[PDB]
Amino acid sequence: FTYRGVDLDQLLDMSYEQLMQLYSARQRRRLNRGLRRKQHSLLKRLRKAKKEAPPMEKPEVVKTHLRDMIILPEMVGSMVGVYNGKTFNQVEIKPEMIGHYLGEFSITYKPVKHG
Amino acid sequence: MLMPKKNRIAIYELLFKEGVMVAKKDVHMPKHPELADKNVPNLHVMKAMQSLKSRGYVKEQFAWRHFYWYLTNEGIQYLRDYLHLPPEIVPATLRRS
Amino acid sequence: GVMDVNTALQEVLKTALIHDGLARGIREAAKALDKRQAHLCVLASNCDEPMYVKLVEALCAEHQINLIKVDDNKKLGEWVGLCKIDREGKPRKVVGCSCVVVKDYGKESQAKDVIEEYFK
Amino acid sequence: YTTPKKNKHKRKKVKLAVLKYYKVDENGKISRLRRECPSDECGAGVFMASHFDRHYCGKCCLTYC
Amino acid sequence: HQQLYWSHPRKFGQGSRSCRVCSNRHGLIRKYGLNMCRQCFRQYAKDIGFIKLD
Amino acid sequence: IHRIRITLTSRNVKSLEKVCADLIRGAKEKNLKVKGPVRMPTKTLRITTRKTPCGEGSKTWDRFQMRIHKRLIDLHSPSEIVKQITSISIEPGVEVEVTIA
RNA sequence: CACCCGGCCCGGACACGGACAGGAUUGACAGAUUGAUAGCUCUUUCUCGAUUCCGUGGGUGGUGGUGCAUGGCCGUUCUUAGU
Ligand SMILES: [Zn+2]
Ligand SMILES: [Zn+2]
């Protein structure tokens, strides 16, 4: 795998600053404006949920209402339960989805079948 | 409601000093503008005046978005007894002729 | 002279009432006393638990606080001004404060002239 | 409802709590069993708590290990 | 608690504004700093000074 | 004494014309240099709102006009005389603002 | 913002009874808990001082119902010459 000509192994060690320009204009602006308490609180929960997990079996689910959180190299491999308004949708954060939001991977409405 | 004695006596002594009270009908307003430095939320003023009205010591009127309150003779009596002042002192509404 | 020794208590307490100079109970009295911002303490004999009287007397003796001694609980509470009275003005509902402490006095010559002289 | 019922927290009623603060000997050694809160306003007026593995002040929210 | 009651920001938006008379937040006339509902303005237009000419 | 100007602003025309004319003839009889009424463009405040509260009808509209008529009279006179000539002339339904230099 | 899922708060005046300075009650660090650094709740103690908290009566809120209970505006019959 590679993202914008940068392999994941040096995305991890890469710091908060020079990660900004690699992302698209929207995310770049979001990171420029800086993250609030609940975003950091989620990251802390996710890195802890990963740290306490076994080295073979996948990290235990972390539930959240934060649909508007940007996926970071830190969050790759994590099991996130994203709130859709009604229930929680479980998602394994893959390396390829490092630009988008959580909200995109938990669909709010049921797909329409006509009758 | 549950509010500290300082706020209660501050509202009562203002009411006794002037003889009237005005609130803006908003529970979220940070501090009453007349009671600045004392740190008295508008909520406390409204509910204090409501509590004193319910017994029948103060006459309320409501214009557009503002509460208005007039202290009566029973209120004057109640306040003089509660605040502990000598009968010599009278409100600004009862000073002139 | 003419006035009774215990009569000063009521005058002092009822005159110190307006200034809010009367630390009531023990978990307010002790913490006020521990700053040394208190003058006098009043304790009742009707104290079933032992440790109460020895604690308050020891703490009051510690920083040289003078003591007035009252007989029962309900009377002290009535003198300080806790009790609720009826339309005629008789004590209906009474609550006992076994230990009371004072920080600030009022201005009463008839009260001041005797109460301190009880400690001479 | 799916939940049985959500009950409000009731404060555990303790009798004469300030007697645990002092330990007065017969000849009169008034030793404070709980530690004093070292903050400005609390000083000499507030006796900071002693939990199983930490200290805590209810007024200023000061904590020590 | 204290940090969740009126916690949501209201510097801008339709919820931040309200009528000076009835405290409604729909069909609000905020021109010339009237800051008043359209129904309430029609009631108080005459005694404000606004006149109907043509 | 230098260049006091007097800004008379009102919603009524008749009252504004009357009061300003009185100030002028009051100044003229004292033998004072006066620069006459400078009539600025009339400010018209327009509000156009639906007649109905509900919103079911034939979509009729009210047209609320508010007129503001502004006059400037300029004097080359001393402040003592300007104060008393500005003091005597009061009328409910005109605003007067006096400025020096 | 009425609607759907989930979670704090009383901002339940006033009166009567019980409770009650030998403390009615208030707020909360830490860890667990939670979407949440919400003391919401659990463990553990601290902290405020008759302002409350429990029962009955009685209020106070509502973009809750009824425009076929109503007032006010508003539209239309009806832009014609009608009364
Ligand atoms: Zn402290
Ligand atoms: Zn309105």
UniProtKB/Swiss-Prot annotation, chain A:
<comment type="subunit">
    <text>Component of the small ribosomal subunit.</text>
</comment>
<feature type="cross-link" description="Glycyl lysine isopeptide (Lys-Gly) (interchain with G-Cter in SUMO2)">
    <location>
        <position position="94"/>
    </location>
</feature>
<dbReference type="GO" id="GO:0000056">
    <property type="term" value="P:ribosomal small subunit export from nucleus"/>
</dbReference>
<keyword id="KW-0832">Ubl conjugation</keyword>
<dbReference type="GO" id="GO:0006364">
    <property type="term" value="P:rRNA processing"/>
</dbReference>
<keyword id="KW-0687">Ribonucleoprotein</keyword>
<dbReference type="GO" id="GO:0002181">
    <property type="term" value="P:cytoplasmic translation"/>
</dbReference>
<dbReference type="GO" id="GO:0022627">
    <property type="term" value="C:cytosolic small ribosomal subunit"/>
</dbReference>
<keyword id="KW-0963">Cytoplasm</keyword>
<protein>
    <recommendedName>
        <fullName>Small ribosomal subunit protein uS19</fullName>
    </recommendedName>
</protein>
<dbReference type="GO" id="GO:0005829">
    <property type="term" value="C:cytosol"/>
</dbReference>
<dbReference type="GO" id="GO:0000028">
    <property type="term" value="P:ribosomal small subunit assembly"/>
</dbReference>
<keyword id="KW-0689">Ribosomal protein</keyword>
<dbReference type="GO" id="GO:0005925">
    <property type="term" value="C:focal adhesion"/>
</dbReference>
<keyword id="KW-1017">Isopeptide bond</keyword>
<dbReference type="GO" id="GO:0042274">
    <property type="term" value="P:ribosomal small subunit biogenesis"/>
</dbReference>
<dbReference type="GO" id="GO:0022626">
    <property type="term" value="C:cytosolic ribosome"/>
</dbReference>
<dbReference type="GO" id="GO:0016020">
    <property type="term" value="C:membrane"/>
</dbReference>
<dbReference type="GO" id="GO:0003723">
    <property type="term" value="F:RNA binding"/>
</dbReference>
<dbReference type="GO" id="GO:0003735">
    <property type="term" value="F:structural constituent of ribosome"/>
</dbReference>
<dbReference type="GO" id="GO:0045202">
    <property type="term" value="C:synapse"/>
</dbReference>
<dbReference type="GO" id="GO:0097371">
    <property type="term" value="F:MDM2/MDM4 family protein binding"/>
</dbReference>
UniProtKB/Swiss-Prot annotation, chain D:
<feature type="zinc finger region" description="C4-type">
    <location>
        <begin position="37"/>
        <end position="60"/>
    </location>
</feature>
<feature type="cross-link" description="Glycyl lysine isopeptide (Lys-Gly) (interchain with G-Cter in ubiquitin)">
    <location>
        <position position="23"/>
    </location>
</feature>
<protein>
    <recommendedName>
        <fullName>Small ribosomal subunit protein eS31</fullName>
    </recommendedName>
</protein>
<feature type="cross-link" description="Glycyl lysine isopeptide (Lys-Gly) (interchain with G-Cter in ubiquitin)">
    <location>
        <position position="29"/>
    </location>
</feature>
<comment type="subunit">
    <text>Part of the 40S ribosomal subunit. Part of the small subunit (SSU) processome, composed of more than 70 proteins and the RNA chaperone small nucleolar RNA (snoRNA) U3.</text>
</comment>
<feature type="modified residue" description="N6-acetyllysine">
    <location>
        <position position="20"/>
    </location>
</feature>
<comment type="function">
    <text>Component of the 40S subunit of the ribosome. Part of the small subunit (SSU) processome, first precursor of the small eukaryotic ribosomal subunit. During the assembly of the SSU processome in the nucleolus, many ribosome biogenesis factors, an RNA chaperone and ribosomal proteins associate with the nascent pre-rRNA and work in concert to generate RNA folding, modifications, rearrangements and cleavage as well as targeted degradation of pre-ribosomal RNA by the RNA exosome.</text>
</comment>
<feature type="modified residue" description="N6-acetyllysine">
    <location>
        <position position="29"/>
    </location>
</feature>
